[PDB]
Design a binder for this molecule. Structure first.
Ligand SMILES: Nc1ccn([C@@H]2O[C@H](CO)[C@@H](O)[C@H]2O)c(=O)c1
Ligand SMILES: Nc1ccn([C@@H]2O[C@H](CO)[C@@H](O)[C@H]2O)c(=O)c1
Ligand SMILES: [Zn+2]
Ligand SMILES: [Zn+2]
Lengths: 294, 294
């Protein structure tokens, strides 16, 4: 078991510990559970889906990286496929408050990046901030997404964001998690191609600036992040954060990032290069290359 | 009249145009109205405060800088003093979506930076995004701040952000717009001292990293911005944005920024230097110095 899960797991109910212990055995447990795995957990405990999601929030919160706040928040995004994706918040010393990722952004990006086509609900152990309510309104699930919070009745997103602003207001009809492929040819080495492929999936209807970052670990594992804009602009998830969300949830740590590549257009109205370099250098990576899309 | 106001003013009601025309005569009208001025406007038109604020939103929206969206939004923050501060959204080509300022952030920062101690209401011509609802919950006005939107009943912030996250959740008791003075000695030239004084007012309870940016214009006018953190971290207003909000609202343009200074601690957990330099270079300023606080 990856040590981050040790105390969380110790606090779990006996029959749940028993059902999970095979799954969490592996140090690189992918912070995700398939439909088959949630069925097993339900049979071993008698918990229904919403109660199981709440019981599991301590393992999601165990993936939080919180050097400034020490306020660990876990979220679980339940895909329409039946897969459950964990998510946790990350704060980066040496960067700015704008580089923070929230537990909800982590869980939704985990699902989108894994190829999930839509979400049915998200369970979080603390009420969503307004920045994440706005993030969630970018999704193809719209205001109907169900939010589950400890000790409250479930509600759709429309209840947490009354009289909402979102894509419709700027006449945008392609929503985050819809099928997007921008068609750039992949070139370069493995890492450059991962970065361009990530850029090909980006949600960027407002600036039309596609980008993707790919991180190569010391053991050769690659983690890629696509750019996801938001109608309120600032809740946008930068490309780097996607890659870092996956790296952390899959069991790795910043010390084993070996090199990174950012792919983007040179003439794009928004430029990710400076924030990507700066945050990666703050994390200790110094091998950052940029690939240009055409 | 500063040309940005020309079409907006032309669309105004005759008795209102008459009352405003002395005020808007000056090219450097400070995008603000004193209590005495709103009284005059009420006597000249018969409008009450809320209706006057709505009638004036076209002049606030006229200060928007929107190269990506062309979606101009104006806001008017009504101080507890009786002064009304305009605010408009700004988007910066060559930067990232995280550098955007919303009309609400612009109007609240205009008030805070001008020395306003608290707000009574804010009027916006489009419903607030969740990022700004969270920004507004940082204020000493809390969830009681009144939001006025065209064609809707006024509501407190608690109605737009049900089951809100905010300072209380992280045990913070000093709120934005409360009296803060961090006590750094001012040194250096006029610009360095402006930057350190701005840093002395910053709201930074979560990272304890004070910062302030000061911009010197070609005619020697200085504009300073203090750093304002937010409990949800990402809605934080960077120091640069404060300075740029004031520069734009007071009638200037990016071409006349001559040099800038950023003041901050070297050992602070969050660092503003890279995003400040990058965005200012995107705007064309290349003379950026950093001053260290001790
Ligand atoms: N519902 C919440 C509330 C806060 N946070 C985060 O917790 C910390 C303090 O706000 C930051 O990391 C921020 O992203 C969450 O992710 C989820
Ligand atoms: N109520 C709103 C809605 C959107 N915006 C902004 O309008 C643009 C498109 O979202 C961006 O500049 C963004 O900051 C506002 O400021 C106010
Ligand atoms: Zn959040
Ligand atoms: Zn906003």
């Amino acid at each position: 078991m990856h040590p981050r899960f040790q105390t969380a797991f110790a606090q779990l109910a006996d029959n749940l510990q028993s059902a999970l212990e095979p799954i969490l055995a592996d140090k690189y447990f992918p912070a995700l559970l398939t439909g088959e795995q949630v069925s097993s957990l339900k049979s071993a405990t008698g918990l229904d889906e919403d109660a199981l999601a709440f019981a599991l929030l301590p393992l999601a919160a165990a993936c939080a990286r919180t050097p400034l706040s020490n306020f660990n928040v876990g979220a679980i995004a339940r895909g329409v496929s039946g897969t459950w994706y964990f998510g946790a918040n990350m704060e980066f010393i040496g960067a700015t408050m704008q580089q923070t990722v929230h537990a909800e952004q982590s869980a939704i990006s985990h699902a989108w990046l894994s190829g999930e086509k839509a979400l049915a609900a998200i369970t979080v152990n603390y009420t969503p901030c307004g920045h994440c309510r706005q993030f969630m309104n970018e999704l193809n699930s719209g205001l109907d997404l169900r939010i589950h919070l400890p000790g409250r009745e479930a509600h759709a997103l429309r209840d947490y964001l009354p009289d909402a602003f979102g894509p419709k207001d700027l006449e945008i009809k392609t929503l985050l998690m819809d099928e997007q492929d921008h068609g750039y040819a992949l070139t370069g080495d493995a890492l450059s191609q991962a970065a361009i492929a990530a850029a090909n999936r980006s949600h960027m209807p407002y600036s039309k600036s596609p980008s993707g970052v790919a991180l190569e670990c010391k053991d050769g594992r690659i983690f890629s992040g696509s750019y996801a804009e938001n109608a309120a602009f600032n809740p946008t998830l930068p490309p780097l954060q996607g890659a870092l969300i996956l790296l952390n949830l899959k069991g790795y740590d910043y010390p084993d990032i070996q090199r990174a590549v950012l792919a983007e257009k040179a003439d794009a109205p928004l430029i990710q290069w400076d924030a990507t370099s700066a945050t990666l250098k703050a994390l200790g990576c110094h091998s950052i290359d940029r690939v240009l899309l055409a």
